């Protein structure tokens, strides 16, 4: 499979999550995703084919993971936006007020702005601290997916939000949305990963 940010993958033939970003760790290919998507050694599949396994994760507290892929996988510096792509150029952290888009297998590509940083989410499992909030909408299934500026700067991976009974927060005004992502920079230094850029 061609690894693109925002595409669906399954965990142990049950849950679905979305790919965050292609990364490497020395000669190992991988992708960053959300921690709550799977446990260590869970098998990830893309299109019914095994692509790799969860190598590490932290959830709750933080919400981060990376899946080490087999060498058959093709890592690409891109995030899906409909049939088009956004190229990943680096990971400069944008500030509050900055515009940001996110990509995932349920709501697709959605944009909004960063409204707050260092938010705590109190999920059933425990609190996850230090999340950034934006008001781009998102749905169940979008977890793990890319948050990126149109300029190509990778921001982080989808954690969660104030999802309504229809499964997303797209049907409530932007003013009332709270979609939270885990910052990419701490995930990259914690696991010694380097972002694939183009």
């Amino acid at each position: 499979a061609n690894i693109v940010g925002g595409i669906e993958y399954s965990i142990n033939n049950a849950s679905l999550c979305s790919v965050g970003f292609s990364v490497t760790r020395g000669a190992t290919k991988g992708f960053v995703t959300a921690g709550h998507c799977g446990t260590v050694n869970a098998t990830a599949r893309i299109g019914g084919a095994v692509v790799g396994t969860f190598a590490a994760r932290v959830f709750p507290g933080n919400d981060r993971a990376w899946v080490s892929l087999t060498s058959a996988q093709t890592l690409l510096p891109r995030v899906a936006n409909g049939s088009s792509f956004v190229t990943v150029r680096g990971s400069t952290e944008a500030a509050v007020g900055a515009a940001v888009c996110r990509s995932g297998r349920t709501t697709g590509y959605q944009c909004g702005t960063i409204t707050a940083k260092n938010v705590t989410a109190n999920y059933a499992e425990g609190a996850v601290r230090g999340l950034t909030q934006g008001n781009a909408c998102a749905g169940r299934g979008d977890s793990g997916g890319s948050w990126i500026t149109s300029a190509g700067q990778a921001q982080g991976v989808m954690s969660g939000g104030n999802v309504q009974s229809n499964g997303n927060n797209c049907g409530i005004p932007a003013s009332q949305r709270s979609s939270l992502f885990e910052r990419l920079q701490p995930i990259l230094s914690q696991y010694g990963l380097s972002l694939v850029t183009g």
């Binding site: 959300a34 709550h36 919400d63 989410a121 109190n122 999920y123 059933a124 499992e125 998102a138 749905g139 169940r140 299934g141 979008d142 977890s143 989808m158 954690s159 969660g160 939000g161 104030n162 999802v163 709270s178 939270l180």
Partner: peptide, 4 residues
Amino acid sequence: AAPA
């Protein structure tokens, strides 16, 4: 807020 919930995971996703």
